[PDB]
Amino acid sequence: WLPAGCETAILFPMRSKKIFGSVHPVRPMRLESFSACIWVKATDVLNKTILFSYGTKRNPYEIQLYLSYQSIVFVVGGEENKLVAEAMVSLGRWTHLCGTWNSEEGLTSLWVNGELAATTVEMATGHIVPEGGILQIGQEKNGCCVGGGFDETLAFSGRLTGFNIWDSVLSNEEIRETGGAESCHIRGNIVGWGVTEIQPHGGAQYVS
Amino acid sequence: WLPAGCETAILFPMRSKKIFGSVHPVRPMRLESFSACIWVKATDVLNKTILFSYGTKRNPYEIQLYLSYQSIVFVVGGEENKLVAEAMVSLGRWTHLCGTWNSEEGLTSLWVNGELAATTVEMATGHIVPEGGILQIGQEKNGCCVGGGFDETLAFSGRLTGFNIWDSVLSNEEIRETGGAESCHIRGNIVGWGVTEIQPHGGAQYVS
Amino acid sequence: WLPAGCETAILFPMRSKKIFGSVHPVRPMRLESFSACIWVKATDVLNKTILFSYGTKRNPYEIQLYLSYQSIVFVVGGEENKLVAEAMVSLGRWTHLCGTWNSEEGLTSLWVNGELAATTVEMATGHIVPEGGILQIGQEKNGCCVGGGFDETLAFSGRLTGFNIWDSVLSNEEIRETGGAESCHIRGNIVGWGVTEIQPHGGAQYVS
Amino acid sequence: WLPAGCETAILFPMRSKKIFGSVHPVRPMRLESFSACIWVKATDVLNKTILFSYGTKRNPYEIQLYLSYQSIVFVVGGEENKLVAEAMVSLGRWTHLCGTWNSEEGLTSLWVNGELAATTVEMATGHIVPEGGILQIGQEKNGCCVGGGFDETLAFSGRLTGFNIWDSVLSNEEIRETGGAESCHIRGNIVGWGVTEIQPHGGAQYVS
């Protein structure tokens, strides 16, 4: 079974030092504001489980969404800048997680299953995300084919689908639409599920 | 679920610079008239989305069928010769397309879901399709193994099945039969679905 | 859907110059009498479609079962020795074939869907099948590691399952049992489905 | 169909000389006591069919669970130390098999489908399982780079799932819970199904 009428997913059977998936956007990743939603079905959540992470050479923490024991942490700009939802994490159940960001005044937010879960102001005000980064799902940026691999602790185990990124802050109506029962045909422009190239590596598999 | 009782398809999870599928006919492709049907289910359509393309080194535009928004364009001989349907394609729904051609008087036709959608005369009159070319599905003839790859804009994302080519012009009764509820055992002679060799590349997958 | 109770099959999506599957028995193939059954679901039957073939260096035609239009030909020893059944096999439907042989005075027989279809006597009398040959399904003995070589005409396209070989002549009760609705747990000793090693090559797939 | 709501398994289509799966625990395997459960569905059982085996360089028989006809043999420390269940395993049916061990004075036991099947005392008393060995499923350590090497007789053919190892002797309530109808979310700490790395080799396949 699949969450909202989507017909494809990616399976992480296990968390190891080689498993991850890489995203290749078609247009530059420089952003003034953005939105990014995804579907998750977690098997085991640890001290810090990376869902997706965008990072550059000088700063590996440009954008980062990950799960703690019972909370969702959304990071923009750096570690000190983070927004935390309280007690809205589950295991073995499909759940939708969307979050927006605006650089004009640092408005960031988190929505879980179509309902606001967190919000703050004056986060990374005036910041701009640069180009030339590496976008990944299920793992953080680190050496590949060199060194011991990735940190086995931060990896992800479960299923992912519906990974979309927009170049603007979606309105409330759009955000509730994206999590609906017929929401798998609306895809973002920077990244879209089904049109953008996503290459599983190290053991991740496409499943239909 | 697949249409007309077919039990195999090909999946294009993404449109990238390396994804395509190649067809290897058993007999020469030299033709004076031909017919070609296919089942398609598109995910996203750009200004030009190649379904299948046949071309030699001298002329890469011998035969070509592609989608542009809600229109269907059928090309024989070159760009100047093209037949266009208006609003006969959707997204996320299985649809049957079949095109007809005759070099004796240049009669071309397009049928969508068993109904005539376009017709023309004096198209490539007296022209003979050469032999020894290359036939792909979902991509256009270009540098495949080495180079800059293909143009990602023209690639295809979705599902395809039931790709048949005949060496003659099918009659109206045969054309309506081919899109029937039990038409998946009607295969053409130049190319037949299930007997001819089709090799997905670069990320395309059989869904058998 | 699988024929009787089996939960694994092999798919030949296409007939080409590279597709086949090889069988590696655990014990010698030297035999004075044998029985062999199989499930087939043919897509397109040509003038000679090989199902399975056992051949040695000096004689590539030791044992051979194949289809020719709506007829079944069973060969032991050589071409001159063949048993033919008429109007037995159809396309796109699961059917059970099983052949019997005895070297004492050449009793050979063919059963289709549990019913006798042919029988003859004094075939290859006194002949002993040698050992050290190559056993294959869906193709005939020929060079394979030269980029091809296999005759594209004789190959097979469809699904196969339940390939068993016994070292003796099964009785009538056993033969009718092997084609029942709870027969997939009855496996032969020389070759058994799910116990013996079978390696698809060139495009054949397991469709468990 | 899979047991206890598990959504993944590993398939052994055959027992060749190269088929096995390797487990890579995160933490050391030095144990004073342990408990290890698994789901199995066997196709054919020989004189000795290995399910999982842990062994070091000096002692290849540190821990071993295997089937012999209709009996289950559990080995800790060597051949002389074995516990045998009489007539409590079948073919083609999912069955749960757990077994605990205590090093304090050698309490070992076997449970089949949540019911005690065997028990003994004073087995490998004072023994400590070393660390730095190799853990495998479906085969015994012989060598994977000798052009094969594994003895085909001992290999396994069927399906496996739910392989967990704990660092302590589970209580009776815990064991009946693990064998329950919704127990697939109860995973052990030394090895857990879905979090620990398991790499099928030589023909074994993940199936969903």
Added chain:
Amino acid sequence: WLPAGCETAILFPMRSKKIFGSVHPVRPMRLESFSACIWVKATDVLNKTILFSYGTKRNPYEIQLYLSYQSIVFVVGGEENKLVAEAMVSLGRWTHLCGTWNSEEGLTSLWVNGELAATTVEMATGHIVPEGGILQIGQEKNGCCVGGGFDETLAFSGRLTGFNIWDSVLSNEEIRETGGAESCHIRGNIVGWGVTEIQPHGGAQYVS
């Protein structure tokens, strides 16, 4: 032994339907005038033996240098335009071949071993070499990922080294310098030996 003091070459042990080498320039190939030199040691010269070829999708004959028995044919723009030096090639001996082109008035030349061998005027006057094509050595453009494809007759067998391309017509002094005994460090800007990426395919080998 290699000429002019070069430590590397490329070996074509044989001419088949897969052997070639591809060049990946760092800057666009759009040119108004150019020069291009190379070292050859031919084993067997045929009716037409391609040394290097540049071609686009529309026009596969943009630039070509090839050997025809004991002659050298230099092609710019198309097949109709060609310059033929005559009686100035051998087998099994290193030889240097350069040629310049100017689009302002269509001046073309050919130098063999530092001596002018041919010259013409009004060749492809006003023509501009497009950009975005494919550059190769030892073969023509189309025929990859087709199961061979390349014409076995036109391929090359021997050794090549010192392949350089400039963006301007080299003067006479520079041309005589390039074929000197200390010229292997004189590399062009569009393509340079030892700086530009040249990856052999299909059986070609780097040799030192």
Added chain:
Amino acid sequence: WLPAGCETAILFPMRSKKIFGSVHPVRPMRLESFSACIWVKATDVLNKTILFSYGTKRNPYEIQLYLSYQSIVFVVGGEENKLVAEAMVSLGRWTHLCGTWNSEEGLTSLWVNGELAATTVEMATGHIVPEGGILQIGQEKNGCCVGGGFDETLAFSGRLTGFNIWDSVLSNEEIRETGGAESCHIRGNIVGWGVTEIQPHGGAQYVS
């Protein structure tokens, strides 16, 4: 060091069950008469060491040249037809072996180091070598993709070079020329060294 000024060879470092090299002639192998020479340097000569072998499906012994303990055996048509030299082969020394055949009257001969060593008459008179077989060096025809299969006893260990085949019986002057110190540029038409495709397999290596 290599003989007669040849600059390439093939190394067989070991005789195994997978080592061999395959030849792909451009034109058909149907022959009325032929001549075939080769350079050989043997490391260990066993009861029968294959140099090159041509065989079809129905007759694996069409043409065969191999070495015995101290003799060279040349076979045309079948095992019963063979010509044997007596004491004219050594180990670790380059030696030229050439033999001709004529079907008009069955004249066969063997030359070793430019000197005639054997001759016979009425050998395979009226025979014609079929076409569509497999040509190999260092091994005899047998299954190769099965996984090993080749009999290690008959394999070859050493170095080979200068393998040429003509379509006619070379005269005495040509035969003495082919073994000279400036002969490595004399290549045959059916097969030529450095022009015909010869791809080693299983551990054989090109060496320069």
Added chain:
Amino acid sequence: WLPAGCETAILFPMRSKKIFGSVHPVRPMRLESFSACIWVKATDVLNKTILFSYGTKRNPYEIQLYLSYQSIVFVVGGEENKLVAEAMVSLGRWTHLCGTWNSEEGLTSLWVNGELAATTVEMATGHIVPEGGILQIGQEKNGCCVGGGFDETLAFSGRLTGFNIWDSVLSNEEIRETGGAESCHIRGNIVGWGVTEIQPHGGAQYVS
């Protein structure tokens, strides 16, 4: 020819987006002072040509040695901390480079061909090089499995050998010894040539 007494090297025939070599030290790279020498023969030096680079996740610029036209730049800690020897490099000639660093007082030095070329004080005083980074030769850490992802401008083209790293500042006598004609047996402890694992990638190859 090799520089002093070494018998292996690594060849970079070209600079592309994939070529580099990775080093796997046996012991941790945490250092308070170090020395590092290398043999280099450059083909083309650009605005910045990386020889070797050590960097962590938070700081890709921990240690760096690279060539800029006719100068040598040695970097410890970050960009602002650099030592620049000037006019001490050529092209196509073997040259020995070695630099030392001390964290107690920030003493850094550069030696070229056994002669001091630069010296500085108060460079990264009190700094400790972290551990758990990635060490590479000929490239900078940017990305491996993202379809290249290496800046082609910074790559290296030429030959390298004798890469050693010590855990202490070598004395003047040791430094002049390391560049001698009998020095290839003097290997460092953190990294040693011929003892430490160095696996080239993307086109680099060992040569001996």
Added chain:
Amino acid sequence: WLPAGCETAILFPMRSKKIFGSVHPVRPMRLESFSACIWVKATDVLNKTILFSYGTKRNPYEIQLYLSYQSIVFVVGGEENKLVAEAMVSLGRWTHLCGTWNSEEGLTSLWVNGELAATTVEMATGHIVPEGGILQIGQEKNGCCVGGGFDETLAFSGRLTGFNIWDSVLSNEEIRETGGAESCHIRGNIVGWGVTEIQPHGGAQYVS
């Protein structure tokens, strides 16, 4: 340059966790007496550097020869049974090492460069080396693919050639012959250099 006139060797450029070479004898390794000689040229000799090792499942130390700083240790049967020569091995120069064993009275010996270096009596008296073990050069025991790897400490770095094993104790004259300047043509029967299959893995490569 190689010793005694041998054309091939094996290179171990590094000490890693995956480098080794495996030997596949033709006949059983069951022995009551044997001899085994080899040519070695060590780069760095650590506390224990394995040259070759034969071991079975129940006993990984059946036969073992290795270097310990400037000593040579020869092991038959187990750890307690060892013969140690002293000051006999250096670094960077080729040296011949032979050793014989007799089970009748437990006579063991070691020769270095053709001169006796050690001798003992009553070593493994009455012992018989079992059959079905695994023979390797440069590494101790298995773990190649998924065990995690080998112990990098025991690996070997340098060059090896001339590895021969006889089934009997060679006489003194034979032993001095085997280390001569024309000794590369005499090879053992159980294992012979050039006829037996030796397959380098993980980085080792043949060199000529």
